[PDB]
């Protein structure tokens, strides 16, 4: 946007001044280098002084700006901390965006630190809300805390993620019940909305899993997603039963969403397996060239082979589930 | 949209699996090498055991997955067949995308053949619909079939459908003229605005249908059609200013531009064709200068290229002339 | 829509001559073959047919280039009359149409007359207080100065560019006047728009300044920018005393970005000079016999550079105030 270009312009602008500063200095040196040719000549020395003043001047400009920028980040910090307390989702999320941006402007600083801590509160609060996308966002923001940081904040961040997973799971549980409760009542509109929500929890679960990369987390997300198709399959039935032609498309479209979700999870797992083996080869590559085998390393190699057997085994399992989802089309009609 | 986004991903995903096989299968081969050095290294036998099993897993994953998708496409190709029967153009248009979407995934197979047959039915349906843009989209879908397999029965049908689309468009264009005269008698420029507007869309629509077919003759019929539409604009302009809708009459003089656009687009294609032809002619001659003996079979086609190339230029000018006749009225 | 056409037009004329060449190359093929063996009659015919079509294609260019000129002439006349029209949207159309004529055929006389037409329109566009439009008058007019610099025309642009500036400053002043009224009345939407109007003036003025390039122009733009935030601080407090408070903060964020824009513009100028100054220098150190007049040129650039850097400071301080004020 306009402000997002200007933030880069802020990051760019600062770099530009150093760029100009060099140009002064590189030019200065040339005048400095002309000095040695005719040292006695004062005029050149006078010139150096003029251009030097410019350099010194410019330095202050950096000082002011970096102060001003840092000051603006402080002001930006405050808005977030306040936006963290307000329970409204957009307000809390707005606290995140403002927070994250302060970091991007200048990571690895104590100003960023307070912004890092500020995020944490928001994600916990967002973790309370049951909107899947919101819960996904907290995972996004929470994961950013760890990925940027193994740190205590990350250790706390993991809890928010953990809370998020459980929060997403409970959100999955209740919507399942309501979606379940509706079938005997026969209101398909509530079902299509109830159905879509679990899927949202599946995405979240998948999205959250990737960010921390837990195959188990992928599995739970995997567990969630598969049920959805069965739930979507049954929703298509109530639509076919009650003469509800529009909803059928909502059921039909939901089927594809999970497939890509499942596919998204499948491809998510396979990328890890790729990495895992490559670790083994580099690890293995040392053994053959190794003077003497090292058990701690050799055992480490084993786990890699064994976990690939894990990760590969997961792919096989989920593959059937993905094949199951396809089955729902033929049987019902 | 995001369903079409995934189809690239799913096809891509397969390659990473096949990629993983060679990674694993290669990695095993190295372990095989280590075992070759010391054929009695029990652990080396143990490690290899895991991998050939893991390979068996993935090997199963593929056959499962690619079979799963084959059955999947079956759903999509089947469901679209029902959509074609329905009269809702949007549903058909939607139906087209699925059959269209299918072919991209698995070109050249039997199921794609079933998609092609489906695509035509919906395309044939759109030739009946009177919306000029819709008549174009049908052609657009129809031509894709001719591209997939020329010289087939479907290639025959497609050209047969594309022809009907060109036919249908003129009827709507004729209709506006009929309704145009009514607008003249009933003194309502606003109607003629859309009436002429519909005509303009036809010529534009007809060009696009002309382009895919890439037949110079059809282009001139589209050109001839467009040339009159420019005259209609003048007929719209005169009646409009007098009878009380200048601001709407502002669109007509603006519409006069669109005709010039269509005329430019027609000529651009006509030349682009002509350039290609003359290139081949040069190529054919090049073969003939080098050749030990002139093979009349090549010469005959070479000359025919020149003859055909000539016709286009004549076609180009008479069009180029009409383009001015369009401007001159302005 | 139209954007594609003018470009699409340019190719076709280019491709036409381009096509004409391929024909002559084919003729070159038959001319050589013919020279190798005069006896082949079949070459002559194919030459003739190849020769026949070339004339037609050559003719078509004449038809088209002529016809294209007529439309450029027609648009010029319609552009002029639309120029007369007071309605502002009509004014743009004239420009938009008038520019098309120029970019379609730079340097031509017909193009010269349109550029002349163009110039009249911006003057009419200058009068209207809407800041967004004022820049447009400055925008299109500046294009003319670059197309025909230093001519009798360029002075009109420069003078026309100046006229907007004198007019523009008052439209921002009207906002200051409107807000004090808006403040007493208490309409939060009414007060915010005045700031956004003042903010618009800023971005417009710097663009006008940046487009002419004079460091002075950006300087006059400097003083206004600072006090917009002092206004923007009031509106949020007026709205507090939801929709209006959230945007009031945004306005401050738009000002600082505007300060930044002014900053980058000062710099780019400044930095370009030092290359020129350094490049200027190298020639001096190199040339055995120095040319004192050229030395002076160098000096004024280093002096100017110092002058331009000072401004950055003077600006950067004002900018600094804006952030503090927003605290």
Numbering used by the authors:
A (entry chain B): 0 to 148, 150 to 333
B (entry chain C): 0 to 329
C (entry chain A): 1 to 241, 245 to 330
From the study:
We develop a hierarchical approach to designing multi-component protein assemblies from two classes of modular building blocks: designed helical repeat proteins (DHRs) and helical bundle oligomers (HBs). We first rigidly fuse DHRs to HBs to generate a large library of oligomeric building blocks. We then generate assemblies with cyclic, dihedral, and point group symmetries from these building blocks using architecture guided rigid helical fusion with new software named WORMS. X-ray crystallography and cryo-electron microscopy characterization show that the hierarchical design approach can accurately generate a wide range of assemblies, including a 43 nm diameter icosahedral nanocage.
First, we explored the generation of C3, C4, and C5 assemblies with WORMS using heterodimer fusions. This resulted in head-to-tail cyclic ring structures dubbed “crowns” (Crn). We solved the structure of the C3_Crn-05 to 3.19 A resolution. The overall topology is as designed and the backbone geometry at each of the three junctions is close to the design model. A deviation at the tip of the undesigned heterodimeric HB is likely to due to crystal packing. Each of these structures experimentally verifies three distinct helical fusions (two HF, one WORMS) from the building block library that had not been characterized in isolation, confirming that the building blocks in the in silico library can have sufficient accuracy for subsequent building efforts.
